[PDB]
Amino acid sequence: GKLSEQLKHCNGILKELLSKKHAAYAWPFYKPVDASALGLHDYHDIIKHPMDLSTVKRKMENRDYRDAQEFAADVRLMFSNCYKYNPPDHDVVAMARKLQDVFEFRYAKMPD
Numbered sequence: 574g575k576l577s578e579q580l581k582h583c584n585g586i587l588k589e590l591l592s593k594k595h596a597a598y599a600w601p602f603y604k605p606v607d608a609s610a611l612g613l614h615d616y617h618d619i620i621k622h623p624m625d626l627s628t629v630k631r632k633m634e635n636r637d638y639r640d641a642q643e644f645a646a647d648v649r650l651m652f653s654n655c656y657k658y659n660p661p662d663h664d665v666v667a668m669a670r671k672l673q674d675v676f677e678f679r680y681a682k683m684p685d
């Protein structure tokens with residue numbers, strides 16, 4: 574089916590985002606933000622829907638994503654949270670922008 578093929582494309586993108594090739598800028602997005610650990614006591618007041626690649630991986634493994642759009646919405650939410658919370662000149666924002674460039678260019682090659 575088309576939905577199967579498009580979700581294989583998404584799974585390939587997910588595997589690439591988690592790969593050693595992108596680890597230098599992808600690592601901030603590997604696991605949920607631990608606000609308490611970092612003293613970011615405003616994080617959950619500002620970010621109502623946290624997202625990270627471990628959560629995307631769990632949802633893909635559990636067949637939670639019914640289509641590519643649902644997968645893309647979660648990956649883009651992860652970047653949006655980073656752009657919303659952090660000052661735009663912070664290193665983590667530069668790293669989000671680099672990983673989003675990897676995501677958007679490969680996502681755009683979606684099989685019809």
Ligand SMILES: CNC(=O)[C@@H](C1CCOCC1)N(C[C@H](c1ccccc1)c1ccccn1)C(=O)c1cc(C)c(=O)n(C)c1
Nearest residue numbers: 600601602603604605606607610611654655658659664665
């Ligand atoms: C204990 N947590 C961390 O130190 C790590 C996690 C360690 C476990 O794997 C996931 C990342 N960071 C990244 C960290 C950082 C600390 C605080 C403020 C912003 C980023 C970072 C990034 C880039 C460069 C230097 N440091 C975060 O939680 C993290 C990530 C994102 C996307 C974010 O928006 N925020 C606010 C925090």
